[PDB]
């Protein structure tokens, strides 16, 4: 109809209005200032530990707050609590469903989030008087898979399916209390920052979108992939965030400048981007391509800086400890590893 | 574990034994039937679980000294390139697909009928990277309003390149050939092909002979002989 | 989760807890792997152990106390109902009252540090006519279930358990035990009289 045209036109021209703003601003690289900057000398990483017993197919794994503990998720029903020092499986648990994709490890040590393709998300406490491992509370509501989860605070909690739909829960009452739509494809993926105050998504349709916990709904977008958007995660600091996607290519992004700040990618893969991690220092980031291998990559001049090849399969999940002793790996074939 | 204090020993005790119980619990889980269950949702999926039986729909059944496992995921209502990939090792394939829905118009668009989008979907579904070495079982249900429908109305209307003796039995024939013809590879993968009407007293013995093969060929290349 | 006491499980996972008994008696770990004895009495009494039925017998005050051995775990949490390094307490008696701190000394003759860090110290309270409960492990964390009033501290041969507020509840009996290496060795008893 003629008002629908007349506000697309209106909608496109407000687009291109943003658009004219945000190069505005344009005047320098992040290449360009840090070009000077000497470069980091060859990482060589070794396999300290490895850890098996997964008899299965892993999805998930996740760091612990004194970053010796860690908990992974494989498909047949199991979730494995670690110990990273002595190689000790400190718990097992059984579960319910057993096509898993995702799982999170509380801040406080108590509490660990399951739960995937069954449009339920289970929380099971870890430190229960009765000494094992029991679920809590069932978190249900959503009309896709689950991608993610990641716990706020010790009671709240925010999960993103497969509906393009976010939700921020209480486990107290077990219910929704913020709702977070305006996704057209799929999400994949989420990130909180430090302060637990804001938090990006990201969608198949190769946009990502930063949501204000307080007020519960969009601030800003920001799109350039081509493809559909596996990992994210923010910058120590706080202030910016690297996304990877299936299209062999990531990009690292900024909150008070929308731009572009760099583009890693290489030639040689065409393959894209599973898992992406940052280190202690933001000079080092950690993208685990799905080649069969890892890679190691220069954060402030976009160079490749030691390859993590230990891997028989695919690459699924990496995580960081809290304090960057050393990085830890899980992979499609049912093994982890911890380099150093 | 000389090193070892008197509280770091039964820790690895403790590792050990969750190790054999995992070892153990691990073994269970080979030793079933999968199956994964796929249709148009109109095409009579649910008649046809409800008939073979005695977010995702799990079915434990047992037959013949067999276990399956049916995995149902019509109700995801979501990306299919997505989590695919998750089916990897499934042992067959059962595809459903309604016969008596040629004449049947979508009611999203009227110009597409049923049959064209069971065609795409199966050709989608067969062609899967994750899937060159799966087999698929193809079942045509509700042959009946099929049989009385192509007599009032021809079957020209949705095939108007089809030259036949417009009965059943030619009809039939026609559609079947043309199910087979989305086959792609005709050497590791081979499609069985069946009919049935509401009643029913032989499918199980169709899906238990499939299976048996698969179970046949897959042990046969396990020890290098095939 | 509760112990009657042999003894008997009702209200938690019997099977994933090893056993100790309280002078120590014998410790049984999970699935029987490994079983020690003490060098007194090896020999006369014996320890067995029934997951099915969750009963512990012991052929021959005698206590029973649960624990469970990782990172971040409580050990002797339970205590139920009711060559060698020695432990020594030279205080016997203090009177006090409620409202001012209180300062008990255990000593020892090498070092608890361990190489994983873990000092094997373990001070518990036993009440007038009450099962002993547990107040501190590894001699820097507290316990659950018990007032925030307790703490300790200490190093090298000399540890101290303290108390800054003081009520009328802190009436008892207090006990360091030592759990370096098998057998267990318990300090001289330290009474407390209001």
């Known amino acids: 109809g003629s008002e629908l045209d007349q506000l697309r036109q209106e909608a496109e021209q407000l687009k291109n209005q943003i658009r004219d703003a945000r190069k505005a601003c344009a005047d320098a690289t992040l290449s360009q200032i840090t070009n000077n900057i000497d470069p980091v000398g060859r990482i060589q990483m070794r396999t300290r530990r490895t850890l098996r017993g997964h008899l299965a197919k892993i999805y998930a794994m996740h760091w612990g707050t004194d970053s010796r503990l860690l908990v992974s998720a494989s498909q047949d029903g199991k979730l494995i609590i670690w110990d990273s020092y002595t190689t000790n499986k400190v718990h097992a648990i059984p579960l319910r469903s057993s096509w898993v994709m995702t799982c999170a490890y509380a801040p406080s040590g108590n509490y660990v989030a399951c739960g995937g393709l069954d449009n339920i998300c289970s929380i099971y406490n870890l430190k229960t008087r009765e000494g094992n491992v029991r679920v809590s509370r069932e978190l249900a509501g959503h009309t896709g898979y689950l991608s993610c989860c990641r716990f706020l605070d010790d009671n709240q909690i925010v999960t993103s399916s497969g509906d393009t739909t976010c939700a921020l829960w209480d486990i107290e009452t077990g219910q929704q209390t913020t709702t977070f739509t305006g996704h057209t494809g799929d999400v994949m993926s989420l990130s909180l920052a430090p302060d637990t105050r804001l938090f990006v998504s990201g969608a198949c349709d190769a946009s990502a979108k930063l949501w204000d916990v307080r007020e519960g709904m969009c601030r800003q977008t920001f799109t350039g992939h081509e493809s559909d958007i596996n990992a994210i995660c923010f910058f120590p600091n706080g202030n910016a965030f690297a996304t990877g996607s299936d299209d062999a290519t990531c990009r690292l992004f900024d909150l008070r400048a929308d731009q572009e700040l760099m583009t890693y990618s290489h030639d040689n893969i065409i393959c894209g981007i599973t898992s992406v991690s940052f280190s202690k220092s933001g000079r080092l980031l950690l993208a685990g391509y799905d080649d069969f291998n890892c890679n190691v990559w220069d954060a402030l001049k976009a160079d490749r800086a030691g390859v993590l090849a230990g891997h028989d399969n695919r690459v699924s999940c990496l995580g960081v400890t809290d304090d960057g002793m050393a990085v830890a790996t899980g992979s499609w074939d049912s093994f982890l590893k911890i380099w150093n | 574990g000389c090193t070892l204090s008197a509280e770091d020993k039964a820790a690895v005790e403790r590792s050990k034994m969750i190790d054999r119980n995992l070892r153990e619990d691990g073994e269970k889980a080979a030793r079933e039937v999968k199956l994964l269950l796929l249709g148009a949702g109109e095409s009579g999926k649910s008649t046809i679980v409800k008939q073979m039986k005695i977010g995702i729909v799990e079915t434990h059944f047992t037959f013949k000294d067999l276990h399956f496992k049916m995995f149902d995921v019509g109700g995801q209502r979501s990306e299919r390139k997505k989590w695919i990939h998750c089916f990897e090792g499934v042992t067959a394939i059962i595809f459903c697909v309604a016969l008596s829905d040629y004449d049947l118009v979508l009611a999203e668009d009227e110009e597409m009928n049923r049959m064209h989008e069971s065609m795409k979907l199966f050709d989608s579904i067969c062609n899967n990277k994750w899937f060159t070495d799966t087999s698929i079982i193809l079942f045509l249900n509700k042959k009946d309003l099929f049989e009385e429908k192509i007599k009032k109305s021809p079957l020209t209307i949705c095939y108007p390149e089809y030259a036949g003796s417009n009965t059943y039995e030619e009809a039939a024939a026609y559609i079947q050939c043309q199910f087979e013809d989305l086959n792609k590879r005709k050497d590791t993968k081979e499609i069985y092909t069946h009919f049935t009407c509401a009643t029913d007293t032989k499918n199980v013995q169709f899906v238990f002979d499939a299976v048996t093969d698969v179970i046949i060929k897959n042990n046969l290349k396990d020890c290098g002989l095939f | 989760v509760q112990l009657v006491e042999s003894c008997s499980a009702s209200?938690?996972?019997?099977?994933?807890?090893?056993m100790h008994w309280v002078e120590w008696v014998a410790y049984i770990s999970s699935g029987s792997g490994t079983i020690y004895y003490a060098d007194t009495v090896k020999g006369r009494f014996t320890i067995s152990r029934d997951d099915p039925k969750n009963t512990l017998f012991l052929q021959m005050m005698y206590y029973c106390?649960?624990?469970?051995?990782?990172?971040?775990?409580?050990?002797?949490?339970?205590w139920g109902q009711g060559s060698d390094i020695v432990m020594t307490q030279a205080t016997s008696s203090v009177p006090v009252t409620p409202g001012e701190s209180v300062s008990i000394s255990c000593r020892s003759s090498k070092s608890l540090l361990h190489s994983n860090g873990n000092t094997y110290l373990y001070w518990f309270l036993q009440r007038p006519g009450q099962s002993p409960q547990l107040l501190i492990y590894?001699?820097?964390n507290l316990a659950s279930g018990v007032p925030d009033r307790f703490s300790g501290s200490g190093s090298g041969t000399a540890f101290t358990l303290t108390i800054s507020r003081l009520e009328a509840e802190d009436v008892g009996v207090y006990y360091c035990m030592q759990h370096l290496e098998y057998p267990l060795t318990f300090g001289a008893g330290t009474k407390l009289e209001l």
């Open positions: 106390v649960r624990s469970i051995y990782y990172y971040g775990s409580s050990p002797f949490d339970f």
């Open positions: 209200g938690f996972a019997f099977s994933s807890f090893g």
């Open positions: 590894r001699m820097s």
